[PDB]
Amino acid sequence: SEPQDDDYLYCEMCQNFFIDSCAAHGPPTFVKDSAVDKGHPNRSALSLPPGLRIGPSGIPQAGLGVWNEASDLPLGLHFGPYEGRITEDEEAANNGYSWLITKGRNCYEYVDGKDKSWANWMRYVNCARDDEEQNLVAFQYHRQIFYRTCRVIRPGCELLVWYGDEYGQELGIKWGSKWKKELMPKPEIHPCPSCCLAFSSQKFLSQHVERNHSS
Ligand SMILES: [Zn+2]
Numbered sequence: 001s002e003p004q005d006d007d008y009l010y011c012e013m014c015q016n017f018f019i020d021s022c023a024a025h026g027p028p029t030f031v032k033d034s035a036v037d038k039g040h041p042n043r044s045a046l047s048l049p050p051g052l053r054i055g056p057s058g059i060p061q062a063g064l065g066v067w068n069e070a071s072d073l074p075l076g077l078h079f080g081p082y083e084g085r086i087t088e089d090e091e092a093a094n095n096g097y098s099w100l101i102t103k104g105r106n107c108y109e110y111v112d113g114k115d116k117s118w119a120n121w122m123r124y125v126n127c128a129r130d131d132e133e134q135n136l137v138a139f140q141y142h143r144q145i146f147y148r149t150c151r152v153i154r155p156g157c158e159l160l161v162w163y164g165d166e167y168g169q170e171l172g173i174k175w176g177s178k179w180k181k182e183l184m185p186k187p188e189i190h191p192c193p194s195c196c197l198a199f200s201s202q203k204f205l206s207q208h209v210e211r212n213h214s215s
């Protein structure tokens, strides 16, 4: 047996892939949705875990977003699966609430969370606009979409998701290549102490602090 491309997790501290639990850091924590019927009118809002808040986004024109409220979300915390209807209808593609799920050999499906009655709270999470504000990574695991924290998320910071090589077309194009296996050049995360951003180096963090907070 051989794990499939979407059987791996990524440890945000090691910055590398693992199966089941990280040899250095142990098993990741998966947060459970508050349980509610797959069918109620407001299921999505009610599936929200304690500690998070749906409310007006900090991104102009975004509408609603999801905010961290109670306490720090540790680094490498997992949410999901993203819920919705599975479909091959390309109309889903850019409908604002759908993710691509790849099945190998350039085949794809979508999980569509547009309908609040069959989706979960993750439908309200807005996409990051840049690397500095992104604090969640959407990635495929067991043919399903999960979000992991790529930062310590402090109280009052908006949850903002984006994606990379563990998702969609990039994932689909490398499928079967064992590239995750071969990774097992470490990216750096340098968070700002005064706002919700983080930077890829100390230089960039200092320039930011000096333009935005203190010089
Ligand atoms: Zn680790």
Ligand SMILES: [Zn+2]
Pocket: 192, 193, 194, 195, 196, 197, 208, 209, 212, 213
């Ligand atoms: Zn800042």
